[PDB]
Structure 1
Amino acid sequence: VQPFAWQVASLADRYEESFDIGAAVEPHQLNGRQGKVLKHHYNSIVAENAMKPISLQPEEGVFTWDGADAIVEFARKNNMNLRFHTLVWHNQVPDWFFLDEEGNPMVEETNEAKRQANKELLLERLETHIKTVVERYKDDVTAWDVVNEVVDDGTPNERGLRESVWYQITGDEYIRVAFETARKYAGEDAKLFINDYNTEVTPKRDHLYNLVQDLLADGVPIDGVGHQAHIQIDWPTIDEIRTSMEMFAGLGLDNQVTELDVSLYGWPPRPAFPTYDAIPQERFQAQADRYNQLFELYEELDADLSSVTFWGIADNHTWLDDRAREYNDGVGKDAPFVFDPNYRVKPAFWRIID
């Protein structure tokens, strides 16, 4: 039986010369056993859901700040840094954004002059949203996910841009405007990130690289790349992760690991173990080895890596469970962290604290 997280060495203290150690949180997790773990180990947090666009402006002019504010207050109370996730995404984003003045979806418009008017209207809505949120949180936020997941996994166009509703209506302009507007209101010292998953694998990595270089060439203010790092035990390789970070560092950009979890399964995540107890020890040991290697790499690259955030706290709450259940007939349990569901340490904890 392993000791509780609050009886072992602080991970934030361990990594204080190298990078922040962060966790994704929900407002209901800032008390009790999760609050205890968070205060002991982490010096950074991010909102899992409460700061996404639909969570902040669910209808036009109506802002819902309470969940977000609760997360900011916790960060402030405990001297934590704060990532803002996220100003722009194609999911968890309110429908009203993309309706024209008559109330119909902008993608349905065919008349060229009305499409141009719709584009202008959407970019204006984007600016007001960004302005309002940034004005509220600029003094608390230490890194912004300005845009999230705007690069595609395939090659639908030559630039590899995701053809979401944002792209369909504005092309790449929404990305430009998001960074320009964030810089404008948050000030020159705000750290502006483009965040994405599979930043380690081609062709996506190269599309992202090319995007960043294009935008930099046009003077668009991008300070860093967010590597979601939703990874597996054997995939991606240590070298693929290294090469990605080194590429972006080479452009003068900061790297952050933003949503790290180490799944016990492949993609798709099957076969999955039906419960936490059914998970065999080898999986935790294999995961410990993986975590060791990751964090040695992270330390090696610490001149170009400022923060490492896990997409959760302990194994009792992870979006990876939803995924497991989805490909295993409604039953499955993943275990991605260094703390187990009872907040006791796992083998991976020892292997990254040493």
Structure 2
Amino acid sequence: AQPFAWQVASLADRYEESFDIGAAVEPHQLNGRQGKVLKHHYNSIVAENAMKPISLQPEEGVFTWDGADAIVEFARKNNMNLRFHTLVWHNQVPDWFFLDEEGNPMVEETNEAKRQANKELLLERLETHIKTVVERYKDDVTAWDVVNEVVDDGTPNERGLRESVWYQITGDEYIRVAFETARKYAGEDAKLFINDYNTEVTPKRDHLYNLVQDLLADGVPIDGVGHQAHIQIDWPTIDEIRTSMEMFAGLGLDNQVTELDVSLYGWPPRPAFPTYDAIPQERFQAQADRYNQLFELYEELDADLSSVTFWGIADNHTWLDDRAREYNDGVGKDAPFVFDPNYRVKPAFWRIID
């Protein structure tokens, strides 16, 4: 039978000269078999949810550090590097941010003098969040997702920027302030990233490229691009992935794969197999081929790639299951990793360990 993850050679060791091997984690997963898999195979972690804005400051001046601290303590204890996800995002972000002093949404304000005041107030609240968070964790964090998903999937404006409440109120200044603030309190050696999904595909990739290129010209301290890599078996192509990483490397930036999962399905993910046992072996064999091709590319580009993080540990826990259920009437199971629900290795593991 396929051996347990702790009975085989380490991914971290295997890719030691190329890049860190990372996993997204939750506080309750830092023990038992998940703990055993992590220690054996990975030298980097990231919080799946515990370090998002709402997970850290649910109300103004009210900080909930426990989940994040637990993850940090596991990292210290096991010599793990640690990505911070994330300082700025349009989801999992508390409502109080975007309310004026009177308690009304800033987006409803029409008087321009007050719109300005709300803009400054929002940027000041953002600065305080980043200041407090960074000062607490700067000694442990080795990479910062400073902003997350600020580029749109389409072209609602000519710069391709996501028109979240952040944009509606501040334009792009929230992005500038995020990076400036991060740099100020984390120090010159901190690695600051802009993280996003579908970084391999146009036009989104070109809007990201342009944004980064424009901000760099104004001295905004961006060190790298986070490629979420929420990908599929045949999409995006290896060449699209290559081209994207080379473009950002050409601007003097680092690349990191931040949230890798290789879904068994398309987008949307229908049809989906209803259970894990119902997934045919041949799907896992196609996934393995894909994984071989992914990690040969990664290893080929290792001069411009410092870290590869999976968005989970093993197939028993993945946000791709939420997505599967969503598009298949509440029923569906994905299986994106190289370890199965019982922490036994999959074909994909053998194809990236060799």
TM-score class, shorter-chain normalisation, is over 0.9
- CA deviation vs aligned residue, 1:274-303 (integer Å, no higher than 9, x gap): 000000011000000000000000000000
Deviation at 1:29, TM superposition (A): 0.1
Deviation at 1:251, TM superposition (A): 0.1
Deviation at 1:133, TM superposition (A): 0.3
Q: Distance in 2 between matches of 1:292 and 1:121?
A: 49
Which residue pairs with 1:243 in the alignment?
243
List, as ranges, runs of 4+ consecutive aligned residues in structure 1 with deviation greater than 2 Å: none
Which residue pairs with 2:255 in the alignment?
255
Which residue pairs with 2:179 in the alignment?
179
- CA deviation vs aligned residue, 1:284-334 (integer Å, no higher than 9, x gap): 000000000000000000000000000000000000000000111110000
Q: Secondary structure at the match of 2:221?
A: coil
- CA deviation vs aligned residue, 1:40-89 (integer Å, no higher than 9, x gap): 00000000000000000000001000000000000000000000000000
Q: Distance in 2 between matches of 1:141 and 1:212?
A: 22
Q: Distance in 2 between matches of 1:52 and 1:62?
A: 14
Q: Secondary structure at the match of 2:159?
A: coil
Q: Distance in 2 between matches of 1:319 and 1:84?
A: 18
Deviation at 1:162, TM superposition (A): 0.1
Q: Secondary structure at the match of 2:163?
A: coil
Unaligned runs of 5+ in 2: none
Q: Distance in 1 between matches of 2:282 and 2:136?
A: 47
Q: Distance in 1 between matches of 2:164 and 2:186?
A: 26
- CA deviation vs aligned residue, 1:259-283 (integer Å, no higher than 9, x gap): 0000000011010000000000110
Q: Distance in 1 between matches of 2:283 and 2:77?
A: 37
Unaligned runs of 5+ in 1: none
Paired residues in the alignment total: 354
Q: Distance in 2 between matches of 1:323 and 1:134?
A: 32
Q: Distance in 2 between matches of 1:240 and 1:92?
A: 30
Q: Secondary structure at the match of 2:132?
A: helix
Deviation at 1:192, TM superposition (A): 0.1
Which residue pairs with 1:287 in the alignment?
287
Q: Secondary structure at the match of 1:255?
A: strand
- CA deviation vs aligned residue, 1:209-266 (integer Å, no higher than 9, x gap): 0000000000000000000000000000000000000000000000000000000000
Q: Secondary structure at the match of 1:35?
A: helix
Deviation at 1:181, TM superposition (A): 0.3
Alignment RMSD (CA, Å): 0.3
Q: Distance in 2 between matches of 1:123 and 1:176?
A: 10
- CA deviation vs aligned residue, 1:190-224 (integer Å, no higher than 9, x gap): 00000000000000000000000000000000000
Q: Secondary structure at the match of 1:259?
A: strand
Q: Distance in 1 between matches of 2:267 and 2:259?
A: 17
Which residue pairs with 2:213 in the alignment?
213
Deviation at 1:155, TM superposition (A): 0.3
1:141 is the counterpart of 2:138:
no
Q: Distance in 2 between matches of 1:288 and 1:233?
A: 9
Deviation at 1:109, TM superposition (A): 0.5
Q: Secondary structure at the match of 1:345?
A: coil
Q: Distance in 2 between matches of 1:120 and 1:330?
A: 43
When normalised by structure 1's length, the TM-score is 1.00
Q: Secondary structure at the match of 2:147?
A: strand
Q: Distance in 2 between matches of 1:343 and 1:288?
A: 16
Q: Secondary structure at the match of 1:268?
A: coil
- CA deviation vs aligned residue, 1:7-39 (integer Å, no higher than 9, x gap): 000000000000000000000000000000000
Deviation at 1:175, TM superposition (A): 0.1
Deviation at 1:147, TM superposition (A): 0.1
- CA deviation vs aligned residue, 1:63-120 (integer Å, no higher than 9, x gap): 0000000000000000000000000000000000000000000000010000000000
Deviation at 1:182, TM superposition (A): 0.2
Q: Distance in 2 between matches of 1:168 and 1:327?
A: 30
Deviation at 1:124, TM superposition (A): 0.1
Which residue pairs with 1:82 in the alignment?
82
